[PDB]
Amino acid sequence: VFQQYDASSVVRRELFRLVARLKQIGATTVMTTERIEEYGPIARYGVEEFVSDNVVILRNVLEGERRRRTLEIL
Amino acid sequence: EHQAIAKMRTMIEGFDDISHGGLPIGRSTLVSGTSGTGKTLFSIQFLYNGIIEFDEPGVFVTFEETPQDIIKNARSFGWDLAKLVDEGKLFILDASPDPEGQEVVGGFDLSALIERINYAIQKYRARRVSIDSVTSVFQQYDASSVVRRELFRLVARLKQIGATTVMTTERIEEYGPIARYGVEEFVSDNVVILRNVLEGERRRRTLEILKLRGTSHMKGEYPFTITDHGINIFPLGAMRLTQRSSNVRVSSGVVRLDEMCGGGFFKDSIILATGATGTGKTLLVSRFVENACANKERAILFAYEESRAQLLRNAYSWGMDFEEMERQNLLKIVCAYPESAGLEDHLQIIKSEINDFKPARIAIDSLSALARGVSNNAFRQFVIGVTGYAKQEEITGLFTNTSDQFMGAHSITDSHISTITDTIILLQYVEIRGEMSRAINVFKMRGSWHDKAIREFMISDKGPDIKDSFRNFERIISGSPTRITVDEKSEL
Amino acid sequence: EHQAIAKMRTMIEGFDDISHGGLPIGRSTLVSGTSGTGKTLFSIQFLYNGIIEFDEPGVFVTFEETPQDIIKNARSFGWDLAKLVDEGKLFILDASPDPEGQEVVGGFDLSALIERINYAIQKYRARRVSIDSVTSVFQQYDASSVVRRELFRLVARLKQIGATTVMTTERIEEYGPIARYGVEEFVSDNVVILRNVLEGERRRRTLEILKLRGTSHMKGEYPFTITDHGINIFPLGAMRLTQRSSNVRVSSGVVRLDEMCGGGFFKDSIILATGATGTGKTLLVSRFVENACANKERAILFAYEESRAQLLRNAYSWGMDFEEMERQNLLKIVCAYPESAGLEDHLQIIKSEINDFKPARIAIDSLSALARGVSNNAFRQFVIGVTGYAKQEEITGLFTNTSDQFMGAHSITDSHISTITDTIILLQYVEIRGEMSRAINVFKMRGSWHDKAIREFMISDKGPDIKDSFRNFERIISGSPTRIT
Ligand SMILES: Nc1ncnc2c1ncn2[C@@H]1O[C@H](COP(=O)(O)OP(=O)(O)OP(=O)(O)O)[C@@H](O)[C@H]1O
Ligand SMILES: Nc1ncnc2c1ncn2[C@@H]1O[C@H](COP(=O)(O)OP(=O)(O)OP(=O)(O)O)[C@@H](O)[C@H]1O
Ligand SMILES: Nc1ncnc2c1ncn2[C@@H]1O[C@H](COP(=O)(O)OP(=O)(O)OP(=O)(O)O)[C@@H](O)[C@H]1O
Ligand SMILES: Nc1ncnc2c1ncn2[C@@H]1O[C@H](COP(=O)(O)OP(=O)(O)OP(=O)(O)O)[C@@H](O)[C@H]1O
Ligand SMILES: [Mg+2]
Ligand SMILES: [Mg+2]
């Protein structure tokens, strides 16, 4: 969604707003994010990591031409 | 003052040792790390122990989490902040943004916030302050220089107020810049880094005090664990070589062994049993643990290779009833796969259980197994830890090691622990006439005389029977001997 | 002038050797490092030593820390800067900014400051100047080229004024660019890099003189330690091969051993005892430490494997009363886990205590335990250090090594220290008739004759009893001989 034309701080605020309203509503939510590096930043803007209560990382590691998927609760 | 800076104790286990007394009073300490490293917890524990142990009030400033959530999450450690809030010992000042909306909130910000803080500090007579993620504040639209100044402003004002502060920051790289802007590291007088390093697919949390302007402190990383009691750090390098040492003896559970050891093991001593798979290490352990019950003493057997059932089946087949030892409350078995945790975790589980059960003896069936995966240095560190704890605690410890190669093993340990051990019991296979027999040797014993024989031995339902040496053999040690003697008896 | 660039001593231990005399006079040296490397301490010690050893006044310009703080911090090292400021020998120029706030007072920037530093210099007749974190100043909003110019301007004015200056910078990568803007490197005449390298959860502080325009200096990184006395550097490559060498003998504490060594160890010598675990290295050490007390000489036993109490239990069980040696103030036991320090630190503790106690003998029980973790090269460097020190100080040193494999060991040392050593005593297990007997062998002795036999020996309460050689056996070195009839 902010992959429209945004910078880190704008993302942190918007996310926080959403998560926050959701918590008020009382909803249990799962929010999905993209990453480009298997071991780099947690998510794109290097800001979602700290704005959420829980973080789960799905990895699909290469290593020798085979692919291994791993799940981590960070 | 004409004195070098004084510290405030955090009471956070392990930390005051690493920091040589605590955090510098009146200054602020930057604590940064990646997501989920324990920043927020450190800061809460710092205020909490402040209140519960010195009756020093605390002000907790929050920029993102909600006071209700900060109180709610602390229940995870058995802490009632809501109570302390109530008794005016703790005051959470909410600095988070409202889920609705206003623009241009950078200016008045700092300043207002600062007197909000000053106001709260003055109001509750606070001694401790924690500001949770200052990072998130300029994460509004800023560049390094603007950050550097704002930080500086804040630290400064707080210094003036005279508050001892813990400030929290986020990082995105485990070994990348200290904190997001690459500027916070320098503005702060003290910097602490919490790491949650991956590796294998395991994670190891470490704490490092990078710098404390004015005083000394331990250097490097130290492994820690978050538990129901919060942050727990083990300064494995701060453990001193001052363990008590007696001349008291205790039994191995095998009389013949006891003789070989010049009258049983020393009470104060680390014993290591080694040898190829199937030798008889587990048998020796069982026997050593039983011996402490038959003498109505408590013993823990931490097993990393067999189930609690299997241990019981095999034990009973060697005589010894583990069932009874259990009921009688003299013997306690543990069991867990090496992989179900990190060495740091294991070490703590061990220590923890030693405290609830106060054993007189302890056995870890297979260090060799705990070495599975882990690096050698991480491992050696682990051994010194369990070993040294045992030693300073007057607990007799028997550790087991399976050698990677049966017969021909050229070193006592593959991980080179032999030096970290007082007595060494060696088990080996000896090929004698197309058959695999066993041999047992007391390779070494620090304070006694012990037997230098490589005695053969058998295993039955009665347990271990130690027979005689292989006198008429050369290359016993090699596992594949050779018999000698070329003169039976003839005439004059 | 017409001659060889003159240097001002820093008096910072070890630095003047590395820099071949000190900082070049009248020019400025850049000293950069990451957070907590000791930039600030260097720069203060340079001024403080100036004042206290040469009565050269100093000016310390601070852009971030507060003067009260600078003063407070120095108390860590037992230095009263407030006194020096009062006596007019030191002047701390506060250039930090207003916690309060304004943004239009420094529109006269570099220019103005340069005037106050010149005013201060003249006023206090300053010879040394330390500018702390110049970096932080343009960390206002600048680009590489702007920094290059300002720095140059400053360096230059100070050069004109004639002052010898220490300028401090910050870096973010231990081995990346030299300072923040990749520009200060080239504008200073001298560059000094302070590193706090991580590597294995341990930290190691290293100092490097990267360049000194116009003179020579030692190249590369040298380890150092920040202590109560401030920066301490050991230029391990600056130690010369000029140790004194006598023919005098001393006892090993074991007469028969003395015989085998052709009358004892040499006073000036480094003796190595190697052997599988449990062979008896520690018994020899005990015995060698005890012999120095019976002769009323001081000996230090640095122990890295056993507790002070255990050492005592086992020693007493071998005769010898370590208790008395202690009281009599003839013997001193240390004890520490290799893990409780870096080799650099360890080395220094050792030196340190040798200095406070002036021993005649010294025994390090298990060099092999100090090699735990560390790199071979880092470790060899350590050995040369302790060895060399004992050698030039006329102290007789007995060091221990446990070989990784009992029986069949194919080298004296796994770390290959043999050769840096004068005498090598060797202990090994020998399988004789289903039993594990021991054997001792004086493997090599540099200026003497020594016995070539591999004698069997026993350990009792009385101690080590060296018996006879296994004449009627082959492959004794294998550990598994072959009694030939
Ligand atoms: N009772 C507990 N037992 C063991 N682990 C705990 C327990 N409670 C919390 N944890 C662990 O501690 C973590 C909490 O981290 P914490 O809230 O301290 O702050 P953070 O990681 O520093 O910062 P943030 O999450 O605000 O980005 C959890 O991720 C979890 O792994
Ligand atoms: N009732 C019994 N009677 C005769 N021999 C037995 C009996 N029980 C076990 N054994 C023998 O003892 C061996 C078991 O080894 P033990 O349990 O002592 O541990 P270990 O050799 O130290 O370690 P690991 O089993 O993991 O290799 C078997 O290989 C077997 O020969
Ligand atoms: N008495 C002392 N004993 C041992 N170490 C000390 C003592 N006092 C201070 N230290 C150490 O020295 C360090 C001080 O470094 P210093 O203040 O010199 O400047 P810096 O690291 O160069 O720069 P910055 O201003 O970014 O912190 C501390 O991080 C600490 O490790
Ligand atoms: N009172 C004693 N009587 C007979 N032998 C003893 C006595 N005390 C120790 N020993 C023997 O001496 C050995 C002790 O070795 P020692 O303490 O000298 O150190 P080490 O072999 O050099 O090093 P490490 O113990 O670290 O392996 C034991 O293996 C044992 O056989
Ligand atoms: Mg087993
Ligand atoms: Mg020893």
Side-chain angles (χ1 to χ4, degrees):
Chain A
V1 74
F2 1 80
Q3 265 271 303
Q4 278 206 313
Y5 44 31
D6 301 83
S8 73
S9 54
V10 198
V11 179
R12 180 166 215 154
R13 258 181 288 116
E14 301 295 0
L15 263 203
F16 182 71
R17 175 189 304 164
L18 180 58
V19 162
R21 283 288 291 90
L22 277 161
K23 203 177 248 136
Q24 302 176 333
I25 307 302
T28 311
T29 313
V30 156
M31 286 168 56
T32 247
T33 319
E34 20 205 65
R35 327 166 72 197
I36 344 278
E37 214 311 66
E38 222 59 62
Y39 287 110
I42 280 23
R44 268 182 194 290
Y45 305 85
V47 160
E48 314 78 332
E49 283 103 301
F50 311 89
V51 175
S52 311
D53 293 284
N54 325 289
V55 178
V56 173
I57 307 160
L58 295 182
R59 282 183 247 254
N60 191 200
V61 177
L62 197 26
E63 147 248 280
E65 311 206 329
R66 287 307 90 201
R67 282 265 187 196
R68 169 174 206 181
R69 2 194 52 141
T70 56
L71 165 150
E72 162 167 44
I73 292 178
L74 216 228
Chain B
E1 181 60 56
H2 296 274
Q3 300 271 272
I5 48 189
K7 296 153 178 173
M8 183 165 98
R9 284 159 85 211
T10 56
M11 287 316 281
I12 291 166
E13 229 242 71
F15 190 78
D16 301 336
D17 306 67
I18 290 167
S19 66
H20 293 337
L23 299 185
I25 293 103
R27 297 184 167 168
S28 50
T29 300
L30 173 71
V31 178
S32 86
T34 57
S35 185
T37 34
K39 285 163 263 149
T40 314
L41 171 62
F42 191 89
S43 88
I44 290 306
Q45 190 166 340
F46 163 63
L47 301 194
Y48 188 82
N49 298 11
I51 300 183
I52 290 330
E53 292 261 357
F54 306 111
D55 194 77
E56 314 188 358
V59 161
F60 190 81
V61 176
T62 186
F63 286 90
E64 234 160 45
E65 270 167 77
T66 239
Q68 5 302 296
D69 289 331
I70 286 111
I71 297 154
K72 176 72 147 186
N73 294 326
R75 287 179 200 295
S76 178
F77 310 96
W79 301 337
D80 182 19
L81 308 192
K83 173 163 156 180
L84 304 183
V85 166
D86 235 55
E87 321 181 322
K89 294 310 186 178
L90 171 69
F91 165 73
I92 291 171
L93 125 49
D94 196 339
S96 72
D98 298 330
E100 217 305 286
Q102 181 166 79
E103 277 245 289
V104 199
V105 182
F108 344 45
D109 208 294
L110 213 154
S111 335
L113 190 60
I114 309 233
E115 271 161 89
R116 291 196 55 180
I117 300 159
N118 190 12
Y119 186 88
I121 295 181
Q122 268 186 52
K123 179 163 173 182
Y124 296 80
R125 278 169 277 159
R127 301 312 264 68
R128 309 188 179 213
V129 185
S130 277
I131 299 164
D132 215 1
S133 70
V134 311
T135 302
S136 64
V137 78
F138 4 77
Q139 263 270 302
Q140 276 207 314
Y141 38 35
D142 299 85
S144 69
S145 56
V146 196
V147 184
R148 181 160 204 149
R149 255 182 288 123
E150 298 298 358
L151 253 199
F152 186 61
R153 174 172 312 157
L154 187 60
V155 172
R157 282 292 285 100
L158 280 147
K159 213 170 217 141
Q160 305 180 328
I161 313 296
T164 331
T165 318
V166 157
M167 283 175 58
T168 255
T169 333
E170 25 205 63
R171 301 179 69 197
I172 347 288
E173 206 312 67
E174 224 52 68
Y175 289 107
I178 275 36
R180 259 176 198 301
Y181 300 94
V183 160
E184 311 84 319
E185 297 101 296
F186 308 93
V187 170
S188 307
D189 305 292
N190 326 282
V191 174
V192 168
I193 306 163
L194 297 186
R195 281 187 259 246
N196 194 199
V197 171
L198 198 25
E199 116 202 332
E201 303 185 313
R202 291 307 85 203
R203 286 262 191 203
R204 164 179 203 164
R205 346 197 69 133
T206 65
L207 170 145
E208 156 157 49
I209 287 171
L210 217 216
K211 76 175 173 158
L212 290 178
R213 264 166 198 166
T215 29
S216 60
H217 59 79
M218 293 185 84
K219 280 91 189 165
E221 289 175 286
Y222 295 82
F224 80 90
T225 302
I226 301 183
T227 79
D228 292 304
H229 295 315
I231 290 151
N232 203 97
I233 318 164
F234 316 82
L236 307 182
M239 179 189 35
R240 293 187 187 181
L241 202 49
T242 317
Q243 11 261 44
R244 286 176 282 153
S245 184
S246 85
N247 244 300
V248 178
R249 304 266 188 154
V250 214
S251 188
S252 60
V254 184
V255 197
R256 197 68 190 86
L257 228 182
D258 279 296
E259 283 173 52
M260 291 164 84
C261 296
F265 299 155
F266 276 112
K267 178 171 142 293
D268 292 344
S269 83
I270 292 303
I271 325 295
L272 173 76
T274 348
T277 185
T279 34
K281 285 110 63 195
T282 315
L283 176 48
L284 292 190
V285 154
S286 296
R287 197 80 144 211
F288 167 91
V289 141
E290 179 223 51
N291 188 285
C293 297
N295 270 304
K296 296 179 187 182
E297 301 172 301
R298 290 191 171 183
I300 306 176
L301 156 42
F302 295 95
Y304 302 73
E305 298 174 319
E306 301 186 69
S307 92
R308 2 200 150 195
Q310 213 190 309
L311 274 178
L312 262 151
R313 175 186 89 187
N314 300 347
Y316 195 77
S317 302
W318 284 323
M320 51 212 310
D321 184 308
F322 270 174
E323 276 295 66
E324 202 56 63
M325 322 267 88
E326 301 222 82
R327 299 158 198 156
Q328 285 191 278
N329 247 58
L330 296 181
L331 172 287
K332 179 176 195 198
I333 305 180
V334 164
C335 307
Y337 283 96
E339 298 66 44
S340 64
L343 261 42
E344 56 174 21
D345 295 293
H346 283 297
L347 198 222
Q348 186 194 69
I349 306 286
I350 304 189
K351 266 177 180 160
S352 157
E353 229 149 301
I354 293 174
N355 303 318
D356 317 337
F357 199 58
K358 66 69 173 170
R361 295 189 177 197
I362 234 170
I364 292 179
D365 200 346
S366 194
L367 277 177
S368 77
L370 281 174
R372 297 186 223 166
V374 182
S375 74
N376 199 267
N377 296 331
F379 183 61
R380 259 166 168 193
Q381 212 191 77
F382 172 77
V383 172
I384 307 299
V386 186
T387 260
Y389 188 68
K391 253 190 170 180
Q392 70 182 45
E393 215 68 44
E394 299 277 72
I395 303 180
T396 320
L398 172 56
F399 309 77
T400 273
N401 177 76
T402 287
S403 74
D404 266 339
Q405 69 178 61
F406 66 97
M407 311 192 10
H410 266 309
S411 54
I412 273 68
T413 289
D414 294 303
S415 40
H416 319 314
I417 315 304
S418 334
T419 81
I420 286 63
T421 192
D422 295 308
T423 300
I424 290 153
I425 299 298
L426 167 46
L427 309 190
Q428 61 152 282
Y429 287 124
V430 190
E431 177 192 315
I432 292 288
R433 287 155 177 167
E435 290 182 53
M436 308 263 91
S437 49
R438 299 92 194 299
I440 180 183
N441 167 71
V442 171
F443 199 75
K444 96 160 162 172
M445 244 204 120
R446 267 161 178 176
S448 145
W449 152 91
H450 90 88
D451 173 8
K452 327 311 166 156
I454 304 163
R455 309 179 168 296
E456 120 157 272
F457 81 95
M458 60 120 254
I459 292 173
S460 61
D461 333 299
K462 297 188 177 197
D465 180 59
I466 301 176
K467 286 158 277 176
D468 297 293
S469 65
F470 303 82
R471 195 185 320 86
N472 41 328
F473 287 99
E474 287 198 6
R475 296 181 187 188
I476 285 304
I477 287 308
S478 84
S480 274
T482 271
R483 158 126 41 196
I484 329 294
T485 65
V486 179
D487 54 343
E488 354 87 23
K489 275 162 267 181
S490 242
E491 226 228 4
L492 96 113
Chain C
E1 190 21 42
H2 298 312
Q3 282 128 306
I5 289 77
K7 293 166 181 165
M8 177 161 105
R9 293 176 67 208
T10 64
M11 291 314 281
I12 291 166
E13 227 237 76
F15 188 78
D16 302 320
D17 305 76
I18 297 179
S19 59
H20 293 334
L23 291 184
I25 283 113
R27 309 180 151 162
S28 50
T29 304
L30 186 68
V31 168
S32 86
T34 52
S35 179
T37 39
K39 281 156 283 164
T40 311
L41 180 51
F42 189 91
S43 88
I44 289 288
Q45 205 168 313
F46 167 66
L47 292 202
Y48 178 88
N49 289 359
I51 294 186
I52 299 315
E53 288 275 341
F54 307 121
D55 191 64
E56 309 181 350
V59 159
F60 185 99
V61 178
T62 183
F63 285 109
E64 232 163 60
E65 273 172 77
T66 241
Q68 354 313 296
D69 282 329
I70 285 116
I71 293 165
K72 189 58 168 194
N73 293 327
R75 289 192 195 280
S76 192
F77 315 97
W79 300 337
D80 196 347
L81 309 191
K83 164 166 157 182
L84 300 189
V85 166
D86 212 61
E87 304 192 335
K89 303 300 193 173
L90 171 65
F91 175 61
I92 295 164
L93 166 24
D94 183 353
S96 84
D98 307 319
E100 273 61 67
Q102 288 113 48
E103 303 279 306
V104 214
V105 186
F108 308 70
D109 255 52
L110 240 253
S111 2
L113 179 85
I114 286 217
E115 288 146 62
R116 315 163 43 185
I117 298 164
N118 193 31
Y119 186 86
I121 295 188
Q122 273 186 56
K123 175 159 172 182
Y124 296 87
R125 271 165 278 161
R127 304 308 265 69
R128 303 201 186 185
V129 176
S130 273
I131 304 162
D132 215 13
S133 61
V134 316
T135 309
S136 69
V137 78
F138 3 80
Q139 264 270 302
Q140 277 210 315
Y141 41 33
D142 299 81
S144 71
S145 45
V146 196
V147 182
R148 187 157 196 163
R149 256 181 290 115
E150 302 292 2
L151 252 201
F152 181 62
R153 175 184 296 166
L154 178 61
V155 164
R157 289 283 290 98
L158 289 146
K159 208 169 235 143
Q160 303 173 324
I161 307 306
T164 334
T165 317
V166 149
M167 286 176 71
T168 245
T169 321
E170 32 205 58
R171 319 172 69 200
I172 341 290
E173 212 306 77
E174 218 60 54
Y175 285 110
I178 282 17
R180 259 190 202 286
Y181 305 82
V183 164
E184 317 74 338
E185 282 105 301
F186 311 97
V187 165
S188 323
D189 300 293
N190 325 278
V191 177
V192 162
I193 307 164
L194 304 182
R195 283 182 260 255
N196 195 197
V197 167
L198 197 36
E199 145 244 283
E201 303 190 348
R202 284 306 89 192
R203 286 273 193 190
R204 156 179 219 190
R205 354 198 60 139
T206 62
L207 180 142
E208 171 171 39
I209 290 174
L210 211 224
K211 94 173 168 184
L212 286 194
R213 263 183 205 147
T215 36
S216 64
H217 53 78
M218 301 178 87
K219 278 83 184 172
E221 297 171 297
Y222 297 89
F224 78 93
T225 306
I226 292 182
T227 81
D228 282 316
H229 300 306
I231 288 152
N232 203 83
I233 311 171
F234 317 78
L236 306 178
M239 169 186 56
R240 287 181 194 174
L241 206 46
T242 317
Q243 4 269 50
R244 284 172 287 154
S245 172
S246 109
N247 238 287
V248 184
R249 305 266 179 159
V250 215
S251 182
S252 74
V254 184
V255 186
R256 200 81 189 73
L257 224 192
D258 286 300
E259 276 179 43
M260 295 172 75
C261 282
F265 297 159
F266 276 134
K267 180 169 151 301
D268 298 338
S269 67
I270 291 298
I271 335 282
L272 176 71
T274 346
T277 180
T279 36
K281 269 116 42 221
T282 311
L283 163 59
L284 285 186
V285 156
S286 292
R287 203 91 151 182
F288 166 91
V289 141
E290 181 230 45
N291 187 282
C293 291
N295 280 307
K296 302 185 175 180
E297 300 176 300
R298 290 190 169 184
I300 298 178
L301 169 35
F302 294 91
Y304 299 73
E305 291 177 353
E306 298 187 65
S307 110
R308 359 206 160 195
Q310 195 181 324
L311 268 178
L312 268 143
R313 178 188 83 196
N314 302 351
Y316 192 85
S317 305
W318 282 323
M320 51 214 300
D321 186 311
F322 273 5
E323 276 293 69
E324 201 59 64
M325 330 262 78
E326 299 219 82
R327 297 160 207 156
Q328 289 189 266
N329 245 57
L330 293 186
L331 177 289
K332 183 177 195 200
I333 302 181
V334 171
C335 304
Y337 283 103
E339 293 61 43
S340 76
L343 256 33
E344 52 181 36
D345 303 289
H346 278 296
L347 206 202
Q348 190 197 66
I349 306 280
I350 308 185
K351 264 174 185 161
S352 168
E353 224 140 310
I354 291 182
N355 300 329
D356 324 328
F357 194 57
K358 64 56 153 183
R361 290 185 188 198
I362 241 176
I364 289 182
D365 208 339
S366 191
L367 272 186
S368 71
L370 284 175
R372 275 184 223 169
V374 182
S375 53
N376 195 266
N377 296 331
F379 178 62
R380 246 160 181 189
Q381 212 188 80
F382 172 73
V383 164
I384 316 291
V386 195
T387 262
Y389 186 76
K391 247 186 165 184
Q392 74 181 46
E393 213 65 39
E394 300 279 71
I395 304 176
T396 315
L398 176 58
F399 308 73
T400 265
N401 179 68
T402 291
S403 70
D404 273 334
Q405 66 183 64
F406 68 105
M407 311 200 8
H410 262 314
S411 57
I412 272 69
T413 306
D414 302 307
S415 36
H416 317 315
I417 311 312
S418 19
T419 123
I420 286 86
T421 193
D422 302 307
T423 300
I424 295 157
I425 294 303
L426 158 47
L427 307 178
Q428 66 163 285
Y429 290 117
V430 190
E431 181 192 317
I432 296 287
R433 286 161 178 161
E435 293 181 52
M436 300 271 91
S437 38
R438 294 90 189 303
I440 183 178
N441 171 49
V442 166
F443 203 65
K444 88 162 180 176
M445 240 204 118
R446 267 158 175 177
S448 162
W449 152 91
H450 93 75
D451 184 3
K452 321 310 164 164
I454 301 164
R455 300 171 176 296
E456 124 160 281
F457 80 103
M458 64 117 257
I459 299 176
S460 57
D461 325 304
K462 300 190 178 192
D465 187 49
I466 307 167
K467 288 157 279 177
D468 296 294
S469 76
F470 309 75
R471 192 184 321 81
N472 44 321
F473 290 86
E474 250 159 282
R475 294 210 221 74
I476 318 292
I477 235 59
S478 76
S480 275
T482 300
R483 26 217 146 214
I484 42 80
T485 20

